[PDB]
Design a protein around this ligand. Structure first.
Ligand SMILES: Nc1ncnc2c1ncn2[C@@H]1O[C@H](COP(=O)(O)OP(=O)(O)O)[C@@H](O)[C@H]1O
Ligand SMILES: CN1CCN(C(=O)Nc2ccc(F)cc2)CC1
Ligand code: NA
Length: 266
C-alpha cells in the first residue's frame, strides 16, 4: 500500500540528535528556498541508517515521510529475487507516487547475480534528479559489509548511526510507547530503565505489550466475575509479571562490533 505514515517524531524515544539532523535535512529545502538559491545548494536525496536491530531505523524513515506529508514505499531486501527490472519498477512507482519516501529495508541481506541488482540500484539513483521529490532511505544491521559506492556523493549522502538506547533514551522509549494507555501511578519507568541496560527499543516495547495484555485479560475475567454477584489501568504488578519474559535480544559481543564501527567514524 502507498500512504502517508501515522508515526511522528513523538512516537520515537531518544535520538534527539538524529531527529533534528533529519529535519534540517528536510526543512532546509522548504522553509528557506530563498537561500536555497543564494548559494546553489543541491539538496539531500538519501541517507543510510545503521546500527543494532530494533532501535528505530524504520520508525525514523516513516516519521520523515509523516513530517513532509509524503508517500511511503517500503521494499525489504530479500524479496528482490526471481529480475533486474524489479529495481526499475520500484523507482518508477515511487516517481509516480511523489512526493514519496522510498525505504530500502534489510539490505545487509543483499551485501551477502546479486552483483548488479546493486548496480541496477545505483544507476537508478544517479538518473533521478532532486526535482522528482523522491527521498531515499536505507537501513542495515551489518555496516561491516557496505559497498561504499552507495555513499558516493549523489547517492546515499549521509550515513547515520542509530545506537542502542542509553538509560535516558529507555525512559523516553517506555514513555512514548505508553503515551495513550492508562498506566497506574505506582509505575516507575525510570527504575524500569535502570533495570534494562542493553535492551533494544523492540525489547522495551515487548515488556509494554505484555503488561498491557495482562491488564486486559484481568479486566476481562474480573467483570466476568463481577456479573455473578471506571477505566482499568496497567498496574505495577502487570509489569512485574511481564519481566519474567524479558531479556536483551542483542549480544554483548555484537554491541562491541557496532561501538567500534561507529566510534571509528568519530
Ligand atoms: N526509539 C524508539 N522509540 C519507541 N519505540 C521504539 C524505538 N526503537 C524501536 N522501537 C520499537 O521497536 C519496534 C521495531 O523498531 P524498528 O524501527 O523496526 O527497528 P529497526 O528498523 O532498527 O530494525 C518499533 O515498532 C517500536 O515499537
Ligand atoms: C549471520 N551472522 C550474524 C552476526 N554477524 C556479524 O558480523 N554481526 C555484526 C554486528 C555488529 C557489527 F558492527 C558488525 C557485525 C556475523 C554473521
Ligand atoms: Na535492523
Amino acid at each position: 500500500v502507498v500512504e502517508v505514515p501515522q508515526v511522528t517524531w513523538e512516537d520515537i524515544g531518544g535520538l534527539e540528535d538524529v531527529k533534528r539532523e533529519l529535519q534540517e535535512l528536510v526543512q532546509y529545502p522548504v522553509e528557506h528556498p530563498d537561500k536555497f538559491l543564494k548559494f546553489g545548494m543541491t539538496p539531500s536525496k538519501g541517507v543510510l541508517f545503521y546500527g543494532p536491530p530494533g532501535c528505530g531505523k524504520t520508525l525514523l524513515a516513516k516519521a520523515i515521510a509523516n513530517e513532509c506529508q509524503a508517500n511511503f514505499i517500503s521494499i525489504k531486501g530479500p524479496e528482490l529475487l526471481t529480475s533486474e527490472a524489479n529495481v526499475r519498477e520500484i523507482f518508477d512507482k515511487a516517481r509516480q507516487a511523489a512526493p514519496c519516501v522510498l525505504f530500502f529495508d534489510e539490505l545487509d541481506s543483499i551485501a551477502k547475480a546479486a552483483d548488479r541488482v546493486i548496480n541496477q540500484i545505483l544507476t537508478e539513483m544517479d538518473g533521478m534528479s532532486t526535482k522528482k521529490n523522491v527521498f531515499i532511505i536505507g537501513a542495515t544491521n551489518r555496516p561491516d559489509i557496505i559497498d561504499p559506492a552507495i555513499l558516493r556523493p549523489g547517492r546515499l549522502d549521509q550515513l547515520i548511526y542509530i545506537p542502542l538506547p542509553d538509560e535516558k533514551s529507555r525512559v523516553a522509549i517506555l514513555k512514548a510507547n505508553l503515551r495513550k494507555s492508562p498506566v497506574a501511578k505506582d509505575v516507575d519507568l525510570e527504575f524500569l530503565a535502570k533495570m534494562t541496560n542493553g535492551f533494544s527499543g523492540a525489547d522495551l516495547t515487548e515488556i509494554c505489550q505484555r503488561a498491557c495484555k495482562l491488564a486486559i485479560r484481568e479486566s476481562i475475567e474480573s467483570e466476568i466475575r463481577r456479573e455473578r454477584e471506571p477505566v482499568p489501568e496497567i498496574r505495577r504488578d502487570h509489569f512485574e509479571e511481564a519481566m519474567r519474559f524479558a531479556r536483551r535480544s542483542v549480544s554483548d559481543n555484537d554491541i562491541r562490533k557496532y561501538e567500534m564501527f561507529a566510534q571509528t567514524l568519530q
